């Protein structure tokens with residue numbers, strides 16, 4: 001009898017959630033793309049203000065990348081709400097392209113009342129220069145980036161997936177993939 | 192450089208650098224000894240194999256140590272540059288033994304090139320690399336050039352060029368970053 005984030009969204013299939021990662025090597029193709037976001041105030045102790053899921057089958061074109069959809073939605077949301085300081089969390093399934101990173105950064109500059117934390121499930125094209133730069137572009141703008149570990153997948157399952165009481169069911173390579181991807185992110189950001 | 196070379200298919204299958212790999216129970220170690228002289232030709236060169244299963248004494252790192260001891264008697268006290276090309280990174284028990292060795296004998300500098308990190312997600316095996324690095328061993332992930340040198344020197348490729356498998360540089364990037372992360376601070 002308390003306000004849950006699950007009630008504030010249209011939750012995704014378990015299948016839409018895990019099909020990209022479950023028993024699939026880091027260097028794979030994709031079935032879906034998603035971005036689960038959460039909005040809070042300065043105080044992390046507070047209750048979650050609002051949340052939304054941007055999902056779709058893979059390879060939308062630039063304009064409909066979940067990151068851009070988020071920016072359109074959150075630009076209006078900021079206007080239809082009290083002005084204070086907000087902290088935004090993303091759980092996003094794929095790597096930001098350069099075009100999304102630039103639009104997000106410019107946003108972060110015009111609206112310093114907002115800080116952004118990004119959890120990425122899997123890096124892609126991390127060997128391509130533009131994708132590496134996109135990560136640095138976001139860090140430069142003050143966005144915080146981390147790879148999703150068990151807790152984050154678990155949390156994202158609890159808040160955003162149609163789980164039906166059922167618990168998060170981790171795949172075997174999840175911590176292995178995490179270590180590899182977290183080290184690679186770290187590397188791309190420093191160098 | 193007369194080694195008893197390994198078979199092409201043994202190479203391609205054991206030095207494949209997918210980070211997460213099953214069905215490779217064998218560690219392969221190709222080694223080269225030189226004088227600290229950067230010009231000095233290969234003194235000797237050997238190939239050791241060992242199942243990664245129980246006896247850590249039958250790991251190719253251990254076998255190398257004994258061989259290198261007898262070898263270091265048959266010949267003269269001088270400065271040695273050892274290089275390794277190994278298919279899995281050292282288990283924690285071999286790390287200790289190799290560390291100890293390098294400590295006692297300071298006129299030998301070891302450089303370990305690694306195709307894959309063994310249990311990189313496990314804290315105990317992460318410590319192994321830290322131990323080796325403390326003892327002065329240079330740790331590096333094998334990239335194209337190292338796979339190619341290992342091919343030329345240790346494989347029976349009948350003149351044919353080293354040919355890269357799918358995703359060699361992509362796997363490299365993952366592994367090298369991971370190694371760097373594990374040796375930070």
Ligand SMILES: [Zn+2]
Nearest residue numbers: 065096097100
């Ligand atoms: Zn994009």
Ligand SMILES: [Zn+2]
Nearest residue numbers: 247250282285
């Ligand atoms: Zn061992």
